[PDB]
């Protein structure tokens, strides 16, 4: 009766940050003790409660958000942060009670000659609300003249390719991100072994 934590963490293909993947976790037993005790992670920041405490708390629903960004953009996956990823792609609330996990992904997502399969939203009329997901491909109308779905002057496709090549530095290398959020809204059916 274990929770599908491996299906999220050890998956082959990760989603792009503009269309981040979310999985609802309920009616099972998880062990943040095992998941955090692995030297595989670059950043393991949990805001609010701590992993040791999480084994004694229970929640009606747990959410695992997974995507891929650059190394220097992991800072943006945090409460009260700004930037392209935080504003247009993935936004965390200021009162965030959850966990941000990231590890390097160069051996898995970098293709020599450039892996331009991973995209990010480059333009948006407004900043994203927390946990909002925008997957629209609508031409961004920077100017007063309409675009009518065709790219051109002041009319730009809102998504941009990541330039992932294994020769570049660490900050420009891909990173896999998993954001754990705990929801209390219902009975609590996601619990630690304790």
């Amino acid at each position: 009766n274990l929770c599908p934590f491996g299906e999220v963490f050890n998956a082959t293909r990760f989603a792009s940050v503009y269309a981040w993947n979310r999985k609802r976790i309920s009616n099972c037993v998880a062990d943040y003790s095992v998941l955090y005790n692995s030297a595989s992670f670059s950043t393991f920041k949990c805001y609010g409660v701590s992993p040791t405490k999480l084994n004694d708390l229970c929640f009606t629903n747990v959410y695992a958000d997974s995507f891929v960004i650059r190394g220097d953009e992991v800072r943006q996956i945090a409460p009260g942060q700004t930037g392209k990823i935080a504003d247009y792609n993935y936004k965390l609330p200021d009162d965030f009670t959850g966990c941000v996990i990231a590890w390097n992904s160069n051996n898995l997502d970098s293709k020599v000659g450039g892996n331009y399969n991973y995209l990010y939203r480059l333009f948006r009329k407004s900043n994203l609300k927390p946990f909002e997901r925008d997957i629209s491909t609508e031409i961004y109308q920077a100017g007063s003249t309409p675009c009518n779905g065709v790219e051109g002057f002041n009319c730009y496709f809102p998504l941009q390719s990541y330039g992932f090549q294994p020769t570049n530095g660490v900050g420009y290398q891909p990173y896999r991100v998993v954001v754990l959020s705990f929801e209390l809204l219902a009975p609590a059916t996601v619990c630690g072994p304790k």
Partner: antibody, heavy 117, light 110 residues
């Protein structure tokens, strides 16, 4: 789309103020209006831009000597470069990247400014 | 000023050439690279914007990539009309300025 045409004196004495005007073909649009120059047989040197909001950003090399303005009346934006020397001899281009400060899509024909006594 | 470009490039008609542009985290690393063509006597012309997008009226032969701190421009099926100076450009956050490469003079030798 919009059309840019520079108009310039051509000859400016050293230590004086070089002035140019780029005529826009309305000018109350949300564009960045930039100025580019190119020394004879050399590369492109960005001078600066002026936003329709009036916001201003100049090249660090030339910031003290550069002033750019907007004029809704004549539908033109201007460039002024003070304490001009013989290093300011160049072809000056007015360009615009549009509403997003990135690549310059529309250019002017260019005007040659010679600095000599 | 801070973007590095090879002075010269060379190829033969019908072939392909690649012009590279090297910079910093402050410009190419975090900002978009655009490419311009200048035939002598004429104003510069935008070939590539947003790393790989081509504006209206530019053939498929022109292509661009950005990876880390370096950018590349590819010209397929070179013809004699393609002899020109090629400039890369990007915005520099540290300098708060728009930065150009020195330019790459391309010659079709055959």
């Amino acid at each position: 789309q919009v059309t840019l045409r520079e108009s310039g004196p051509g000859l400016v004495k050293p230590s004086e103020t070089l002035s140019l005007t780029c005529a826009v073909s309305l000018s109350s649009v949300n564009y960045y209006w930039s100025w580019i120059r190119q020394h004879p047989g050399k590369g492109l040197e960005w001078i600066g831009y002026i936003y329709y909001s009036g916001s201003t950003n100049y090249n660090p090399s030339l910031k003290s000597r550069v002033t750019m303005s907007l004029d809704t009346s004549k539908n033109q934006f201007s460039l002024k470069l003070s304490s001009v020397t013989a290093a300011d001899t160049a072809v000056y281009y007015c360009a615009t990247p549009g509403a997003i400060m990135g690549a310059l899509h529309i250019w002017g024909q260019g005007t040659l400014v010679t600095v000599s006594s | 000023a801070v973007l590095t470009q090879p002075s010269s490039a060379s190829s033969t008609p019908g072939q392909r050439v690649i012009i590279s542009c090297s910079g910093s985290s402050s410009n190419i690393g975090s900002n978009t690279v655009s490419w311009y063509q200048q035939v002598p006597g004429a104003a510069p012309k935008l070939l590539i914007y947003f790393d790989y997008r081509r504006p209206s009226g530019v053939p498929d032969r022109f292509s661009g990539t950005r990876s880390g701190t370096s950018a590349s421009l590819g010209i397929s099926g070179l013809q004699s009309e393609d002899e020109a100076d090629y400039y890369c450009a990007a915005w520099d956050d540290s300098l708060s300025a728009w930065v150009f490469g020195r330019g790459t003079k391309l010659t079709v030798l055959g």
